[PDB]
Design a protein around this ligand. Structure first.
Ligand code: FFO
Ligand code: FFO
Ligand code: PLG
Ligand code: PLG
Ligand code: PLG
Ligand code: PLG
Lengths: 472, 472, 471, 472
């Protein structure tokens, strides 16, 4: 016999799947009881989460609002239309000059669709090299010639790099490379670059070589919405983004593109108009994706409303201030930060002067409930044991931490790195030897206890701590 | 210019933070439980799945594999993903020594593109079921006019195989002849609108004769496969891809299953040869194509896979098939043309061309009656806007507890709707603008809508509590 | 010290390089003392040869006449212009409707340039499958999936086949495949197809799937010039060819292409014109080739004047009549010819009913001074030991042989295949065992002697038999 | 009736085709009555020409000696074997360490086959940029991004350039580009580079990036054979060449490749052997070409015997001395030569400091029977009106000219450029205006007459002037 609808279909998770329920409750506790510093993470709102976990998941809605491949989309269409209009509003865009596709499943799908829209297979792209701070999907292949991202397989990549001494983008080498390589598309924006971008110069280079210019603002999108960093929309043809990083929304992607009359250009006819909209929509669907994830789109619409608020503007300001305060504390202890500071939400910490690799710092921190990620820095070839760790402010800022709290985070990090060195000095640099120091280390247990005491006190968005299964 | 307290932006319910989106979700909830939802790729998932989907799991970056991540903090995410993978193998009755599974694909189209990228180089040759014959977009779809539609016909070289134009069954002889001439690297089986089971044994014989890999995309029928109610592709295929939101009744996600261990003996193949899909498939998903896994989808999928392994789910799958057959017999008794003259799965494909109708007209009129279908290509179609068919599926309404007699009532509603569509076309014209005039103040549409809603209200509804919904 | 110009630069080959001179003299004797049946071979004229071996070899002339990348082309331009105009005249083409590029180094370069002009990498082509009679450059990959020609690597090939029982092109399967595969270019013409081509049906198929239509007439180009087979120009967008086969010229290629207004077609705009010329020229140079080989172009101009003569039409008629007479004799002995005859210059002889492969027949024939080539027939997978031999009439017809002489050739071939069977019957099918039967074989010696006696009855173009070193 | 064999087949060209015969005789006179300075031209020997115009043209001989697809090759095989063996001898190569394919129809076919042998479509190559002196087939696309050579279409090119101060290859910039772009193949050798090549440094760069190293020695092959320039064979994996430039043979190409045991390398198994031979042969045939041109192969065998002689070594020395003397004379008049001199057979003359383009100098020289070619120099973007002219010594040296005669050539060139300036000064820089000065110009007539008077006296290889139709 079939189970009654109520039994399988309405019973709460806690009863249907106690194993998964318990693991989610353990993860909720973990998010509360640690210092969460992954620069691409955030804590999104309960309101976003209620839309994300909703009956919107049940609907097939391929196509565009008002031109679907399925019936039943009267309300899904209104949700998607509201999501798109709120996206334009959040970034201060005129709807006659910009459009947006909100269907990409995540950031990497958004980028691959934007590229597919404007490029044929094997067309040439240039993005920021991964060890210089660019993303996998900006054309990443290794210095050993190994193609990693599919954006280096289906397209031809030549990454541009930062200056090897200052850590800032080398705009002169960018121009020289672009004039030699003749890319169809230049990508700006990054995953681990701690400075703002001269989009005007990128536009000058793109015009000189006849390339399209795309900005991937995934990491700093929340700061862009708050008008706290340079706006890529002033100079770029296409702007892609994720929505779950500094924008504090669900996991999703968006592709913004110019519409309407083109600016004057010698060699271009008069009354010319942009022609990105149809190509970008087609690339997302039917070229690459299938059904939109409407629960993500609904959740994203919520997040875009929240991003347009004065409270969100203050949040973005505080993110930047917290990142600067943390960077200043770390440099005050003698640590090496790439570019010697930050203009955004992250710092990239070069551990090579200490004789450490980022995997060791990440692992020790993780045992202490300090959540970071090892990260490539300039010149790295090892993804297993890169030379850096990357620290971001969005998630802890969302819990209400201010500059003095981020100075405490700096001291926790300083204690963690000091302990990592002590373990390496005692047990060795080989990872199998280093790991011996991670067992029954009283200093690790004591640092973990201190971190938990610090972390547990702060508020947590997304659920009620008073209702959670694990309060200790 | 202060930040909002965490409680205000971060803990307040959706109903207060975003009344507009809340109201639209409430309207969509009513729409889902007050009409007859017949899109064959839709289902109504459980509340337990939805609670995992809307959870703190959305906040985590966890690129890599369990135990080998690019970020710290994955102690519990790793346990959730491991449980998802093990439950996936268990749901399909697979030995872990012989099969593995990647549960990170964001959806079905991402799963297929990653599976192809794993085993194919750009421009390698594929053969899948042609879209008008019932195959999916991602099976290499380009049109009979030569227009490349799916990226699977751009980045790879496609030659679709077709059904027999008179019987509607796959033409296995032309499949073999085509494969021996075209020499594909990969043959794809499984479909989106094919109403019969698949001779996987014959597909394996063809693949062996031409040296191809064999992949089954069981997206639509995966729930039936898990319940052992249709042929298992795992007996004969190298790789099996699927979505999880169709007959499997889970969240929107994809999975890629692949063989592991020793290869079966083959002449010319060396002794002790082993499969080598695992590393390539994992690498294709990440870092080649995707970024961070969507852990809330993975957790929700783990729940759905536990639910799929139950005796109640097997009974559900049996009932889905029985309902589809009863609907088909009812429609054929009236004279309606079903491809292959019936069904062996969860759907029927209905050719409207003998009536002089296109599927967009039927879909539009049905929608006004709260009967949710999709227009669908049938053999020989070239129009996606106005195809010659409509596709009807049993999973969603079967999940509301409907049995055969209820599906006969659905058949009568569809007969009434198609009759009304034909009557409107006879009175108002075949041109869409003229036809549309017949949809205003149509008393028979209103009567049918009222009858549909009264019938729909007789049944329970999974995923949310009807007693608590805003629009009662 | 440098050698004086007269020593290194003006002294004849016979003194500068006796080894190469002696080998050329032996090759000259071989060509006029055997029976030369390779269907793609001919004996070109002394006049063609004099232009081929000339100071034209010294010139760099990249570009087009009147638009060169080098100085000094006052006369090279006149030679190339005359070659092009004579090419159009030889094929009865109006210069308003057809142009031609005469720079391709050979046939395979001509085809690759024609494809490059109209296709992007990986665009789809369909040509006649090699075992069905098509050329390597028509998209050849094997039934085992191994890409052989670069035309299956840089482009995406789906070959069409002959009917497995009749040997004629299966036009219904061609159309069905083209509608499914949607090629950008369909190629017709072949290397071992013994029948004429329904270019009209090819045009109907090409129009149904929106493809360009190209004919590679390399083998039969001489017959086309003589209006002795169907003209591909009536229906094809592009016609490629070699010049050294039935056309009886130097080794070179040409690409003909339509110019001017396009014929009426639904959907295409009014006043639309062909746009092949610039693309085809650019593909030849600077895309693929470097300097034209002006000695080949000059020699080609000579051959094209000779091909337009009344004597050449008579030659082309005789080539066809000789091929038919040869095929009739062979079938009268019970041999299996693909399609049961011929409409062109060649026959394709299926040896499989005899239990032989073409490599054995080719090898025994070679020992008798009967020059053939083993050849794929339908279903073959082995290039080493294919199931057929291909026999052509152009070369021996150029020595003046007529039907009764080709009947004697048929008898020599019958003797050779009989001896091949006798050796296999005694020594077996394994090649190493078969080869043992070729040592001190008195019947081989007798057949060779009869072949040389017969071959010496006829004149020889291209050089004077009376002046050759080895008489 | 057919024409008798003697009539069509044995009658001399002078009777069969008086039009073509007369044009060849006019061309023979032109070659005698001018100063022929195209650096890629030569005057080959009568002995070469007799093999080139021979019955060898009649033979189909696809395959390799002893492994043909046609009967009848008993003597063609001996000719090809002798050509190959003499090719190895002429370049002082051990047959156990090097092989050679002598079937390429010309230089561009040789290069495309060599690339096809070792590369897949879209693999990466780096060659000398055309304006820096590289050949079309070294990956030429323009600074405007226009793909010109098929070697920039079927493969992915990134050219390396000369240093703008010195005019020599900038080896550090080559290394930097190679490490960023990661080519599969690096090409050295050139068409208009007036200096020798540091093959040792090319090998160091290739090893640092894991690339194959190919030298295209087409222009200087005669100097290489005479051991008068650096040997590429010491360091390159593959060496391609034409045979009609300084080698003084027929128009043809050759591909040399390493064979036998590989040199010691960490990260490579012991007893490793080279594996180029079969791939190179396959690329030439059956991949790209059809029947070999046996008359070219026979003529090439003759030329290779002649190239191995002591007289040819003296010729190669004289070519270099003549180019130096010419360059010294031009620089003494104040002209600008790229790199300030030459180490090979050519000089590249930058006309830009004069306010001239190379098309004007070429046209005026051509009217005076001075045969040159306009040529790109560093920074050029115009193929129509490039900034230089290229001048070579091989052809006139083959007529017996020595250093003092090349000083006279320098004065004729000086008069030509002086006249070009005077015409431009009077009539203007616009080509239509400049062309007005080329009509009824007494100074052009006097220069032409002086050139003819000078040129007519010298000997001419390849035919007997005493027998030519036009002696005035
Ligand atoms: N500048 C930057 N930092 C970043 C990212 C990025 O895209 N750009 N990431 C964006 O997510 C994460 C790192 N993601 C990476 C994924 C794969 C490889 C990589 O090279 N993998 C090789 C080597 C593996 C190994 O040695 O163990 C491979 O997978 O084979 C590197 C980084 C986090 N930090
Ligand atoms: N350094 C160098 N010099 C050389 C050659 C070479 O390959 N490299 N050549 C080797 O043979 C000749 C020049 N060949 C060339 C062929 C085409 C174009 C080119 O860019 N053509 C464009 C633009 C034509 C136009 O503006 O009129 C085109 O064809 O569209 C340039 C040079 C002679 N000198
Ligand atoms: C600049 C940038 N763009 C796109 C993405 C991709 O988003 P998805 O992971 O949702 O595909 C990232 C992810 N970067 C993750 C990190 O820096 O840790 C990114 O940093
Ligand atoms: C066989 C098959 N495979 C893959 C997919 C793709 O799943 P996503 O939409 O999640 O990308 C579908 C979707 N088919 C939807 C339908 O038939 O209506 C499908 O039918
Ligand atoms: C270095 C080089 N390589 C190959 C070639 C091609 O040879 P073919 O033209 O036979 O294809 C050339 C021609 N260079 C001619 C010139 O410099 O004027 C060349 O200079
Ligand atoms: C139809 C056809 N096309 C092109 C070619 C190529 O010509 P080249 O060999 O010059 O590249 C051939 C050669 N066919 C040779 C044979 O059938 O024996 C051919 O048969």
């Amino acid at each position: 016999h079939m189970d009654p609808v109520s039994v399988w279909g309405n019973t709460p998770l806690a009863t249907v799947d106690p194993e998964i329920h318990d693991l989610i409750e353990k993860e909720k506790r973990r998010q509360c009881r640690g210092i969460e510093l992954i620069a691409s993470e955030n804590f999104t709102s309960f309101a976003v989460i209620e839309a994300l976990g909703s009956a919107l998941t049940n609907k097939y809605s391929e196509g565009m609002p008002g031109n679907r491949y399925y019936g039943g989309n009267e309300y899904i269409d209104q949700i998607e239309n509201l999501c798109r209009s709120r996206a334009l509003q959040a970034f201060h865009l005129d709807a006659q000059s910009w459009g947006v596709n909100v269907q990409p499943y995540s950031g990497s799908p958004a980028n691959f669709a934007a590229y597919t829209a404007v490029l044929n297979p094997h067309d040439r792209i240039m993005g920021l090299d991964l060890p210089s701070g660019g993303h996998l999907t900006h054309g990443y292949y290794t210095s050993g010639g190994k193609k990693i991202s599919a954006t280096s397989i289906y397209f031809e990549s030549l990454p541009y790099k930062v200056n090897s001494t200052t850590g800032y983008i080398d705009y002169d080498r960018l121009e020289e490379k672009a004039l030699d390589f003749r890319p169809k598309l230049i990508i700006c924006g990054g995953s681990a670059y701690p400075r703002d971008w001269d989009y005007k110069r990128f536009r000058e280079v793109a015009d000189k070589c006849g390339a399209l210019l795309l900005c991937d603002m995934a990491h700093t999108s929340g700061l862009v919405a708050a008008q706290e960093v340079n706006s890529p929309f002033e100079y770029c043809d296409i702007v892609t983004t994720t929505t779950h990083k500094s924008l504090r929304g669900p996991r999703a992607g968006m592709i913004f593109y110019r519409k309407g009359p083109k600016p004057p250009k010698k060699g271009q006819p008069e009354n010319a108009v942009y022609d990105f909209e149809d190509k970008i929509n087609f690339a997302v669907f039917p070229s690459l994706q299938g059904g939109p994830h409407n629960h993500q789109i609904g959740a994203l619409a919520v997040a875009l409303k929240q991003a347009a608020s004065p409270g969100f503007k203050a949040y973005a300001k505080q993110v930047k201030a917290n990142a600067v305060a943390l960077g200043k504390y770390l440099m005050g202890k003698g640590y090496s930060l790439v570019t010697g500071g930050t203009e955004n939400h992250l710092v990239l910490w070069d551990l090579r002067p200490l004789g450490l690799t980022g995997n060791k710092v990440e692992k020790l921190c993780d045992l202490c409930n300090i959540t970071v990620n090892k990260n490539a820095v300039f010149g790295d070839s090892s993804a297993l044991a890169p030379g850096g760790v990357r620290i971001g402010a969005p998630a802890m800022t969302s819990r209400g931490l201010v500059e003095k709290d981020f100075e405490q985070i700096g001291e926790f990090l300083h204690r963690a790195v000091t302990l990592t060195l002590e373990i390496q000095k005692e047990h060795g640099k080989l990872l199998k030897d280093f790991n011996k120091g991670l067992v029954n280390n009283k200093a690790i247990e004591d640092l973990k206890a201190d971190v938990e005491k610090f972390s547990a006190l702060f508020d947590m968005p997304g659920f009620l701590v008073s209702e959670m299964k694990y309060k200790d």
